[PDB]
Symmetry: C11
Subunit: 69 residues, 11 copies
């Protein structure tokens, strides 16, 4: 199963897993501070992942960068 | 199972799931504000995804950009 | 399964799913306005997809363009 | 399962499904007008496809063009 | 399952399917006129394909031409 | 299953299927006239294939030619 | 099944395994001294791994570096 | 779905020999090729090693090799 | 299943297997002296591997070096 | 399932199959004379293969030469 | 269908040591190689780690490495 790499570029970044199934809502928000890396899979319980905050992201499709409000 | 990366390029972008099955209708619309990134799989419930508003999109077939 | 990306280059583009099975007919027509993007799988219900209107399309086989 | 992309380069192009099985006959013919694209899988019911009329075709093996 | 692309370069091209199984015979011959393309899989009933007539052929192993 | 492409460069080329199993013998010979192409799989019944006569052969491991 | 390589660039790097399942919390923390390497899989019990502290990280998607 | 070897005889009397799969190893078949004939032969439920004797041009997934008589 | 290659660059390198499952602990420490090579899989019993000591390491993601103590 | 190509570069090259299983010993030695080629799989009975004598060897990891 | 390693002895008395798969880890076999011999050895039901002692040229799917005596 695929995974995404997320490196926080400032404090307070949130990687949010959205529930798998007919229902779509946030089940968990993992908070990352500046410099930390989260490597997160898609799973039975998480079928979409949202990133809020400034972060450097790698997936199988390449690099992308989230920008904070 | 594949996924698509969506980065919002302005406020109020909508990433819309369409139901898998005999029936095709919306089911969920995830609102992304500017700079937010959503990475979303195809799933038992979602077999098509629409993007509305200005966003940078990556799939296994390359980059594409939606326009609001 | 494989999926196709379709970006509407003008208003009222139709992405039409043809039923899987012994019978072949349209079960669903998804209208895209200019600039919208539809990322759509082949599925248990859909074994062929037809695009009507000006659009930019990506498949595993590369780029192709439908014209109005 | 594999698919073929067909872009009609003139009106009245026919994309014809041939039946899977001991029997071989045409079970469906999809008519494409100029600039329409059809992306069509091999399936339980369709194990060979025939294109008649001027079209641009992509498959896993590359590009080929049918002529009217 | 893999497929072959055949483009007829002249009228009257035959794409012939050969039976899978202990015995080998032709069970279908599809006629292609000039410019028509057939894309044909190997299947439960067809384990070999013969092309007669002038055509441009593509497979996973690249291009070949019948005459 | 893998397949082999054989193009006959002279009349009378033989493409010979050898039986799968503890016994090895020829079960079929398909005769090809100059310029005919045969695309033939390995199968439940055919675990080796022999070619006699002048032909251009393609397999997954590249081109080889047989000579009469 | 995928794995990540973590090389500690200073003492006390913390590799944190998050529980697979409807609930998310950490179930194990493996500390690495400077120059030590951990090569760790995604598993039935771990579906996300967080790195705290200065580390050089390799995954299938390339190199990334955590900073303390 | 198994791998296969291509053997082109470069002289008469080339032998492609199949060795039995299983606890017993022996030759179970020897296919004679004359000059310029080609044999494309799979590994099988009965054949888990293949010996070539005589001068032949051989292709496997590992590339070209040549046997010498 | 994946494996890692470890070549000891000094005496006394440890290649340590961590238990698969809900419990995580070391279950084995393989000592390598200089110049010895260990090629070790992930397994039903080992889902993470730690190297301590100076070693040259190859994985499917490429070369990494552990630095000694 | 993998295979090794062995080309004898002198007479009496010995290709030795080691038993799969909890015990390890040789169960077959196949001698090759100069210029003969053996293409041998790993199998239910052979999980390690030893070559003695001068031989040119291909495996999926490249070429290697034994020295006799 | 497992991975395999290629070991070529560069001196006499090289040892290719198979380690037991499973909860317990011990040497179950040491195959001794003399100079110039090549062993091609799979990972298996019984062997989940392989140790090489002595001077040898090694190939695996991650590249070449050399053990030293
Ligand atoms: N318990 C969660 C852990 C997780 C994996 N990937 C995530 C992405 C975002 C948030 C949480 C997660 C799960 O198995 O799904
Ligand atoms: N619960 C939804 C989550 C989701 C995944 N991909 C999406 C794309 C668009 C909207 C929602 C989704 C599902 O599993 O299908
Ligand atoms: N409910 C439809 C959704 C769909 C997927 N791909 C499409 C292409 C065209 C039209 C509809 C669709 C299905 O599961 O098949
Ligand atoms: N109902 C048809 C739809 C179809 C798929 N590919 C085609 C090619 C040609 C004609 C029809 C089709 C089927 O599932 O087979
Ligand atoms: N009914 C035939 C159709 C077919 C597929 N490929 C072919 C090649 C030649 C002739 C017929 C065919 C089958 O499923 O086998
Ligand atoms: N009926 C034969 C047809 C065949 C397939 N490949 C061949 C190669 C050579 C000769 C015959 C064949 C079979 O299924 O095996
Ligand atoms: N009847 C033999 C035919 C064969 C396949 N590959 C071979 C290689 C050599 C000799 C014979 C063969 C088998 O199925 O195994
Ligand atoms: N008996 C251990 C052997 C082993 C494999 N890889 C390892 C890595 C480190 C330590 C021990 C091992 C197991 O099967 O898991
Ligand atoms: N017992 C843990 C070991 C582990 C694997 N990968 C990890 C990553 C982080 C922390 C622990 C681990 C497991 O099998 O899941
Ligand atoms: N009967 C043996 C034949 C064999 C295959 N590969 C070998 C390598 C060496 C010696 C014998 C063999 C087997 O099936 O295992
Ligand atoms: N009987 C051993 C043979 C073996 C394979 N690879 C090895 C590596 C080292 C020592 C012995 C072996 C086994 O099946 O596991």
């Amino acid at each position: 199963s695929d995974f995404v790499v997320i490196k926080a570029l400032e404090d307070g970044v949130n990687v949010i897993g959205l529930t798998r199934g007919a229902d779509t809502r946030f089940h968990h928000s993992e908070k990352l501070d500046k410099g930390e890396v989260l490597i997160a899979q898609f799973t039975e319980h998480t079928s979409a992942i949202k990133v809020r905050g400034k972060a450097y992201i790698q997936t199988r499709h390449g690099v992308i960068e989230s920008e904070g409000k």
